[PDB]
Write a structure and sequence with these properties.
The structure is a homodimer.
Chain A lengths: L1 H42 L2 H38 L7 H38 L4 H36 L1
Helix pairs in contact in A: 1-4, 2-3, 2-4
């Protein structure tokens, strides 16, 4: 048993360094977004700019909340997958109803995500008339890496917290 | 024990009054649902008009806005810090959207149809708000009775 504490205390640090590197990526993609923003503001009409900014913000928020709901839903579902083996009286129903509402909120968030995809294409369309193929490339890559980065970040954070709670017991 | 009796009296009276108030609130809720339905059919009317007159892209933007509205408001109320603040910015951006949609509809539509759009939205939010407020008052009064009756 005593070896697990050291092994996990090692992989945990591995994942921590991974969090640091991924954070550096967050900074890079951030300044990249600031430069894309600078260009759009510099070439696009004010309204179009407002639409662009709205899109990036709404993207951040939507992807965030969607990932949160996905997480909590996984926690509940897995809590039932592990609890059905065990025995507890009356507590399953509460997790069933909470599962229900979380499914509602999650499907809502997924609809918002879809709307934000079609929006994304609107923004790309209004940018395609002004920007270059290089600037459009930096834009597409900017958004894609934004979503991917925040996702992977929250996943890693889940794993490291899981390890912490694992050695605490 | 005279003041004890006085307490039983005043407490019972307040119980009856609270109960009546809860009846008023419930009636207000059920009557509100009717308004929700009416504004819903109105919404479908505006949707069909915009559908027939507008382009598929502009129409897609209109539908997107309408879909996002109820969701954003629902979140702001379900929360009302990171979560709630996100809801706040999404609300502001949602208002700016609203003005975009209104601007692309103002030229296509007529005067009365446009008034139907504006009203439809105003009530689309107002009704969710008022409904939340009602559930709040009802919850409060219920808990107060739970405390007084015991």
């Amino acid at each position: 048993k005593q070896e697990l504490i050291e092994s996990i205390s090692r992989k945990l640090q591995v994942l921590r360094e991974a969090r640091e590197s991924l954070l550096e990526d967050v900074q890079a993609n951030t300044v990249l977004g600031a430069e894309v923003e600078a260009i759009v503001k510099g070439v696009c009409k004010p309204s179009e700019f407002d639409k662009f900014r709205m899109f990036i913000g709404d993207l951040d928020k939507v992807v965030n909340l969607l990932l949160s709901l996905s997480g909590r839903l996984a926690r509940v579902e897995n809590a039932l997958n592990n609890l059905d083996d065990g025995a507890s009286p009356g507590d399953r129903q509460s997790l069933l109803e909470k599962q229900r509402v979380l499914i509602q909120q999650h499907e809502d968030a997924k609809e918002l995500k879809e709307n934000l995809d079609r929006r994304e294409r609107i923004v790309f369309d209004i940018l395609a008339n002004y920007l270059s193929e290089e600037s459009l490339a930096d834009y597409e890559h900017f958004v894609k890496m934004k979503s991917a980065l925040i996702i992977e970040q929250r996943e890693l954070e889940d794993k490291i917290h899981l390890g912490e709670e694992q050695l605490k017991c």
